């Protein structure tokens, strides 16, 4: 890898600099290089990895949606192959980023993650990147089931090992609820999960410090916002 000659600590430092400079492709390359050093990632490093790739794939998803909408309009309407070709180009790039992230999780972040806060984080990530693959899949069934399976394993661990207000647990449940609503054509399951997650977190807020309360309630607000959209 092109980052093979750079020290792990320098890759982490440069990932933080790239974040400050809003250079998320660089940030993702630095964090991929850090993962490939073979050592486990700390909490801060796991979040740097996620921030970097979420920003990269987020731009790709936004572009894909614009192009897919243009393509759908063109197929009702005067024609050429260019819209499809360019949508396909962006799609292929997006799939490549998702495959890269999934590859890092499979080689070998998940297998070395034993603590709940690392293992749930990575399994959630696996679900997320399969979900992004599912958004563009048309094949789709197995990708959907791979997302589901990863989220379910993460959920099972999170419910046993984390309090209901843990931000990773909350973010996992939020994203699994989005999976149900947007991918799996299961809006009722989405609503039920969001409601139960919100209510169980509410009941655990009393145990938290002011700073943890702020973190947990911020994520709970997204569950509430989705429930408002969905009902």
């Amino acid at each position: 890898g092109a980052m093979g000659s750079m020290e792990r600590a320098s890759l982490i430092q440069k990932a933080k600099l790239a974040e400050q400079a809003e250079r998320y492709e660089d940030m993702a390359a630095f964090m991929k290089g850090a993962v490939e050093k073979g050592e486990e990632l700390s909490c801060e490093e796991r979040n740097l990895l996620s921030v970097a790739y979420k920003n990269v794939v987020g731009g790709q998803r936004a572009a894909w949606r614009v192009l897919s909408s243009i393509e759908q309009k063109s197929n009702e309407s005067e024609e050429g192959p260019e819209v499809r070709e360019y949508r396909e180009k962006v799609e292929t790039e997006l799939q490549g980023v998702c495959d890269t992230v999934l590859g890092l999780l499979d080689s070998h972040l998940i297998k070395e993650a034993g603590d709940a806060e690392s293992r749930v984080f990575y399994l959630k990530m696996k679900g997320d990147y399969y979900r992004y693959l599912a958004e563009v899949a048309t094949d789709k069934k197995r990708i959907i089931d791979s997302a589901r399976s990863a989220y379910q394993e993460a959920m099972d661990i999170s419910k046993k090992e984390m309090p209901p207000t843990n931000p990773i647990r909350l973010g996992l449940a939020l994203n699994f609820s989005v999976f149900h609503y947007e991918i799996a054509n299961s809006p009722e399951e989405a609503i039920s999960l969001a409601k139960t997650t919100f209510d169980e977190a509410m009941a655990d807020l009393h145990t938290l410090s002011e700073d943890s309360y702020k973190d947990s309630t911020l994520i709970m607000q997204l569950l509430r916002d989705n429930l408002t959209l969905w009902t």
Partner: peptide
């Protein structure tokens, strides 16, 4: 479109 988990601000 539904809201998914956000990065910490």
């Amino acid at each position: 479109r539904s809201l998914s988990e956000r990065l910490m601000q």
